[PDB]
Ligand binder design. Structure first.
Ligand SMILES: OC[C@@H]1O[C@@H](O[C@@H]2[C@H](O)[C@H](O)[C@H](O)O[C@H]2CO)[C@@H](O)[C@@H](O)[C@@H]1O
Ligand SMILES: OC[C@@H]1O[C@@H](O[C@@H]2[C@H](O)[C@H](O)[C@H](O)O[C@H]2CO)[C@@H](O)[C@@H](O)[C@@H]1O
Ligand SMILES: OC[C@@H]1O[C@@H](O[C@@H]2[C@H](O)[C@H](O)[C@H](O)O[C@H]2CO)[C@@H](O)[C@@H](O)[C@@H]1O
Ligand SMILES: OC[C@@H]1O[C@@H](O[C@@H]2[C@H](O)[C@H](O)[C@H](O)O[C@H]2CO)[C@@H](O)[C@@H](O)[C@@H]1O
Ligand SMILES: [Zn+2]
Ligand SMILES: [Zn+2]
Ligand SMILES: [Zn+2]
Ligand SMILES: [Zn+2]
Ligand SMILES: [Zn+2]
Ligand SMILES: [Zn+2]
Ligand SMILES: [Zn+2]
Ligand SMILES: [Zn+2]
Ligand SMILES: [Zn+2]
Ligand SMILES: [Zn+2]
Ligand SMILES: [Zn+2]
Ligand SMILES: [Zn+2]
Ligand SMILES: [Zn+2]
Ligand SMILES: [Zn+2]
Ligand SMILES: [Zn+2]
Ligand SMILES: [Zn+2]
Ligand SMILES: [Zn+2]
Lengths: 302, 304, 302, 301
């Protein structure tokens, strides 16, 4: 069994008080390694998160945006003044959350949760795409249902686009010919009772291709809503089949900025990249900061 | 294999929703059919909305309402339709509407069995029944069984002076008998799903059984572990329709076309009605809970 | 990868309409093999089982009794005119259910469900014992709580008596110094979501000792309340640890009198014995009849 | 280090003649005043069916708080009737696990009020007295399923300090006024794959030392065994744990700690410094009260 190792005992990205769109939280970041650079697309909030009201209240409204950051080394990032993605009004009035970015044939697809704030089920999987990581277009609701924790596979299977999603509480898979209409829905992995992953699970970042399968980092939620990261392996030719699944988490809230924050007891990844035989896993910490942790590819054994 | 299958009559739906009609804005599907007066009489389920089914409870913000529409055809392919549904859910006992009608003619009366859905929880459904003399003036509504239950049809004649009801306490096809079309007794399971097959999660009757010389033709739907709906066939003993004397292993219809694979509920073919015309079985089927198609098989090809 | 084979396509015991106490059902039978004879202690009902009322109602009252039958060949049994155990009033006023009998040293312990009918939770694990399978005494409430599916291990572990029980929906284990007071409660086995054993599980008969561990036949209930038998293997020295568990059931309702009956879709075993290098598994069918199915001991492989 | 029991027998046990303490006496708060041990103990009229989907009227148990006094800390005098019972519907199933803290010249008793309507229908409640006899001013401390609550015996920077237990951690919070709590944070967490893996909660109120605040706590393992552990809080900032012992200081060992209404439980709501010793009173199997001690000089991390 193997574990992620943190590159820092401090966040690598933290809120910026003088930018309203990110003055309270930066977390749950997609990442893509291209042009020998880490391109990070992070969720950012203008406010703390009041989640225990009967409905989302205007007086506690938070708005998520997607910011951009770039790094040579994966640790030190240059950041920018304005977010690169904001929500459309009114269906995404409370913003755009938890992006997962997948490259498929020289196009970049960002899958995110659009949240309208009209009730606590007013969220859905949305998708935009670009050819340059810069000019995002083609917005669509991927599944018109309350759903999230979505990612595209980086290649087609038998000609079909492959979507991971999360009808509560399982990781689901589905297929598409046109990136519009989805079919062959199937549960692929389920929570495990009396474990750290008992309440619900969901995909982390998009799966990483290996020789032995697709690496599926995921998050598991226990009975007290603690988020941890786990890891499984999907079959290479049929990624709807799980062929291995580690019992122990690979990352858990441990540092004080992972245990305490806007949402306590959370580590959460929307993105991970392979650079020089190392997996770099970017993670939100307590829905407040961003950390990064790694594992050598050789140590990934099932 | 040495099996038989339906042949689609057309590669496009024979009925589609109409966006300008609220009551059939998103879906027309799961249709009852009666051949009378040399006309196909089709009674289709229609929905005003998509089907969000993954919530823990039915949510009013995702409410869908099913109505039952009427369409009529001479060739079984091209249908005339109408502005308004012929049956709606009475509010609030059938607040989310009336679903999947099955129509059976017995002694010059027509009996429409449908699922009434109140939407108060996911078990808030029941078999209801209305009847008519003329396929036009439905009346006599009743709850057939006071229990969560659906996939119900009456047999077209009595057996030893008893009415025969097919129903579906999850996950099996059940039979039951009545003297008065009000009280049912001697409930028995007659057919069950088969593990590790296309019909593993649950089964239910399709349309009402069709009388043959060799028995009762029982088209049914089977649901696999991923909730794909396919159609199968079995044969019931002519004198005792509680006994299955044959059952084909492989389905006779399954999602193939894009408008059967993709739709409001992906991967569904579902029949509520099939009729014998000029020694062919015309099987009308909902497709992805969105459109209606028709498939056929020559009566002589039904061999087990 | 292994399954039971029915010895008969008809019940070996059925209700006796002339006997009020066993007029509607005989099922869920404990089994002891002694004196070259099969001893069956079967649940018997005077009535069908209406269960869908807010509370247990006198007009739907059913009474469970425990009858006895004995067989040399395992198929033809000698039966008796009256039951050998009936419920004490008021705590067992609706009778005594699903006995499991374990021989520990030279005493036989029968654990059964006493059902008082005062509420749907008005049931508990009770125990009586005998040295001769004839004179039962020493009645006690094993756990003073709603609980069932109980059996004693046939020997002590580290000087402790071992109890298997079923706080919903798991198979539990507990230990005792004195067969009165129980401690070290532990979940040992849980349902598995999206399978035939998703809703709940419970022990079948008392576990059978093998060289490679304890054979733990159990029942699993799916989302449609279908009851099937499965099989696991517990560690020989620490039976609280499961070392193997077959994925597929070993017995499922298939025959008309297993699928149809007072409670549809049930096969349920309260006893299994080893006879001539074969396991004999007696089972209730549709809570109405008793069947028997076997497996050659050499075919029990995980 | 570890605690040492003073008796291999309970020092308090249920009295079947008294309905309110018919089945159990356990989880007792204590303070030392007037050179007397004042013990405030939870008491139940019934066994504890916990495995139902919701709490059932047919299996209802009612906790009361009783009073007992001792001079040696071992032999206690007891009384016919409880001192606190549930008055209102939020306390329909009674009042549980009191922790008493003296701040300025007043005594505050924080306890769990349990309404029995569902298994989350429990709240941290508080009453207070001048005299340990007349409790007043009942309030819900936090309007949320929470328990294992205690007040610090002093203010920090003029703020009252509350320890609580949003599952599964020990939390701290601050109040200007004992009404509104803010700056909630997690100060200590379970350790997975150990005796304290499933959840932890404060025991009695922390005891002031010169090296910090002594934080006895209970840990719960994967099989629901309750044991006691000990940690040390920074003296000036009790949100900071500066030491924590790996192994328990008390676990079920005697037969009336292993066996009982809730097996495999030792649990303390109360401990006091008396003659250079910590006296740790504990419930055992949620059925009896025992007491164990440690020489304060022996407390080393
Ligand atoms: O998309 C909105 C989203 O909701 C939150 O997720 C969960 C949800 O609101 C509910 O409260 C559930 O029981 O717990 C929350 C997570 O465990 C967060 O993901 C939040 O950041 C988002 O706005
Ligand atoms: O009668 C309501 C009915 O429910 C749906 O049926 C199924 C049910 O909701 C459950 O979710 C099952 O597992 O999946 C659905 C179909 O498999 C639909 O039939 C729906 O159209 C109806 O309103
Ligand atoms: O001990 C009474 C016992 O109850 C039944 O078990 C279950 C129970 O009544 C409840 O309805 C639950 O939801 O499902 C039942 C079985 O799945 C039977 O075991 C019955 O025969 C017994 O009297
Ligand atoms: O305040 C009610 C309280 O509940 C019990 O606590 C726990 C709870 O019911 C739940 O079942 C948990 O998993 O285990 C119980 C103890 O670990 C007891 O503390 C009980 O005495 C109280 O009444
Ligand atoms: Zn700026
Ligand atoms: Zn959107
Ligand atoms: Zn699931
Ligand atoms: Zn998630
Ligand atoms: Zn772990
Ligand atoms: Zn029109
Ligand atoms: Zn109706
Ligand atoms: Zn059906
Ligand atoms: Zn095909
Ligand atoms: Zn007789
Ligand atoms: Zn009893
Ligand atoms: Zn469980
Ligand atoms: Zn059971
Ligand atoms: Zn299977
Ligand atoms: Zn007295
Ligand atoms: Zn209160
Ligand atoms: Zn606690």
């Amino acid at each position: 069994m193997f574990r992620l190792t943190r590159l820092s005992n401090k966040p690598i990205l933290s809120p910026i008080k003088e930018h309203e769109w990110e003055k309270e939280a930066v977390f749950n970041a997609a990442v893509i390694y291209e042009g020998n650079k880490f391109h990070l697309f992070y969720r950012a909030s203008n406010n703390k998160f009041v989640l225990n009201t009967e409905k989302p209240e205007e007086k506690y409204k938070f708005v998520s945006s997607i910011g951009y950051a770039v790094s040579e080394d994966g640790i030190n990032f240059e950041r920018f003044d304005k977010p690169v993605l904001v929500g459309e009004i009114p269906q995404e009035a409370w913003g755009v959350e938890d992006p997962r970015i997948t490259k498929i044939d020289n196009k970049y697809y960002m899958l995110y949760t659009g949240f309208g704030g009209r009730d606590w089920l007013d969220f859905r999987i949305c998708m935009v795409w670009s050819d340059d990581l810069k000019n995002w277009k083609g917005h669509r609701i991927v599944l018109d249902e309350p759903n999230k924790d979505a990612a595209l596979l980086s290649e087609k299977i038998n000609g079909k686009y492959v979507l991971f999603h999360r009808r509560m509480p399982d990781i689901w898979i589905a297929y598409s010919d046109d990136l519009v209409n989805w079919y062959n829905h199937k549960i692929i992995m389920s929570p495990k009772s009396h474990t750290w992953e008992s309440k619900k699970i969901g995909i982390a970042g998009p799966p990483i291709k290996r020789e032995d399968g697709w690496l599926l980092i995921y998050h598991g939620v226990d009975n007290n809503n603690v988020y941890r990261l786990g890891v499984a392996l999907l079959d290479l030719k049929d990624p709807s089949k799980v062929i291995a699944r580690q019992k122990e988490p690979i990352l858990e809230p441990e540092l004080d900025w992972e245990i305490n924050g806007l949402v306590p007891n959370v580590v959460f990844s929307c993105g991970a990249v392979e650079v020089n035989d190392m997996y770099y896993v970017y993670y939100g910490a307590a829905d407040t900061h961003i950390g990064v942790a790694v594992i050598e590819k050789e140590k990934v054994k099932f």
